[PDB]
Design a protein around this ligand. Sequence first.
Ligand SMILES: *[C@@H]1O[C@H](CO[C@@H]2O[C@@H](C)[C@@H](O)[C@@H](O)[C@@H]2O)[C@@H](O[C@@H]2O[C@H](CO)[C@@H](O[C@@H]3O[C@H](CO[C@H]4O[C@H](CO)[C@@H](O)[C@H](O)[C@@H]4O)[C@@H](O)[C@H](O)[C@@H]3O)[C@H](O)[C@H]2NC(C)=O)[C@H](O)[C@H]1NC(C)=O
Ligand SMILES: *[C@@H]1O[C@H](CO[C@@H]2O[C@@H](C)[C@@H](O)[C@@H](O)[C@@H]2O)[C@@H](O[C@@H]2O[C@H](CO)[C@@H](O[C@@H]3O[C@H](CO)[C@@H](O)[C@H](O)[C@@H]3O)[C@H](O)[C@H]2NC(C)=O)[C@H](O)[C@H]1NC(C)=O
Ligand SMILES: CCCc1ccccc1NC(=O)[C@H](CC(C)C)NC(=O)c1ccc(CC2=[S+]C(=O)N=C2[O-])cc1
Length: 218
Amino acid sequence: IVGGRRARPHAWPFMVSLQLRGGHFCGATLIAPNFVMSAAHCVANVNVRAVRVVLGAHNLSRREPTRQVFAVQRIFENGYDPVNLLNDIVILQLNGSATINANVQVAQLPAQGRRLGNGVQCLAMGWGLLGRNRGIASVLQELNVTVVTSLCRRSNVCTLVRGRQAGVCFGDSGSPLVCNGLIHGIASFVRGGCASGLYPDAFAPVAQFVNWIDSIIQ
Ligand SMILES: *[C@@H]1O[C@H](CO[C@@H]2O[C@@H](C)[C@@H](O)[C@@H](O)[C@@H]2O)[C@@H](O[C@@H]2O[C@H](CO)[C@@H](O[C@@H]3O[C@H](CO[C@H]4O[C@H](CO)[C@@H](O)[C@H](O)[C@@H]4O)[C@@H](O)[C@H](O)[C@@H]3O)[C@H](O)[C@H]2NC(C)=O)[C@H](O)[C@H]1NC(C)=O
Ligand SMILES: *[C@@H]1O[C@H](CO[C@@H]2O[C@@H](C)[C@@H](O)[C@@H](O)[C@@H]2O)[C@@H](O[C@@H]2O[C@H](CO)[C@@H](O[C@@H]3O[C@H](CO)[C@@H](O)[C@H](O)[C@@H]3O)[C@H](O)[C@H]2NC(C)=O)[C@H](O)[C@H]1NC(C)=O
Ligand SMILES: CCCc1ccccc1NC(=O)[C@H](CC(C)C)NC(=O)c1ccc(CC2=[S+]C(=O)N=C2[O-])cc1
């Protein structure tokens, strides 16, 4: 996250870190005791057998007893087009069920077809890069964004930080976009570099896939 702030410890217990031998590379969202969802372009190019699903984390630099780590058991896609990043969503079945506690909880999804109007206030988050020569985040970052329909495909939910250059970046892909306590978006791609101030950040529209998500996690 570029231009964000540190999140409160375990403020978003559904936040997931996808890691390859201890190294963070994408985010995800716990949508069931044994299901997370992320961006399809996160798992499409990595070795899935080495992917580790880290739940209940906050600072990736430190040992954390609150962490629960799982492996991927099966992959579910829905017409993922890697060329245009269309339907950039993926569901990962875990090799077990997570233990629900104060630090690990299931996220809430909106209804199928729910559209977010222009100007709705949302919150983006992730453990991604912090900007040009700003390094990478160790503590979970969060950022206030505003939903926009301009410079945005109908197959996407786009957000923009009004008044300053800020947004999601590499490593934030797959992280949730929380609006009204519901996961309306999955961080997909930026344009003109991170925090460009010209293009809005594009998210995968979870609301358009709720019927497909339910058909798998139920
Ligand atoms: C930056 O963003 C934060 C957080 O964003 C909100 O929460 C996330 C999870 C998403 O759902 C976003 O869509 C939300 O906007 C904002 O803090 C929130 O500010 C609003 C005011 O604009 C607060 O709303 C109050 O809610 C009171 C009841 O709280 C309970 O219910 C709300 C949902 O209605 C729920 O979000 C909250 O956690 C409680 O469960 C209500 O009595 C009061 O009248 C008012 O409506 C909201 O509580 C704040 N949330 C938090 C976590 O602090 C910031 O305002 C925003 N910055 C700017 C500048 O706008
Ligand atoms: C579900 O999968 C997890 C993760 O599996 C790990 O990650 C994968 C990507 C692959 O690389 C796997 O080879 C790898 O194990 C399993 O968690 C892991 O289980 C093993 C065996 O129980 C743990 O090994 C132990 O580790 C402790 C230290 O905590 C040592 O003291 C032991 O001697 C032993 O080496 C391993 O630590 C653990 N991973 C983590 C991060 O704790 C999990 O068991 C599996 N669940 C099921 C039901 O299959
Ligand atoms: C960048 C991370 C470097 C790294 C660290 C630890 C362990 C492995 C890797 N390095 C990969 O992780 C690479 C990344 C590439 C961009 C180079 N990636 C793979 O090694 C890989 C393995 C198997 C598959 C099978 C397919 S094919 C398909 O269509 N969907 C799949 O999952 C794909 C990629």
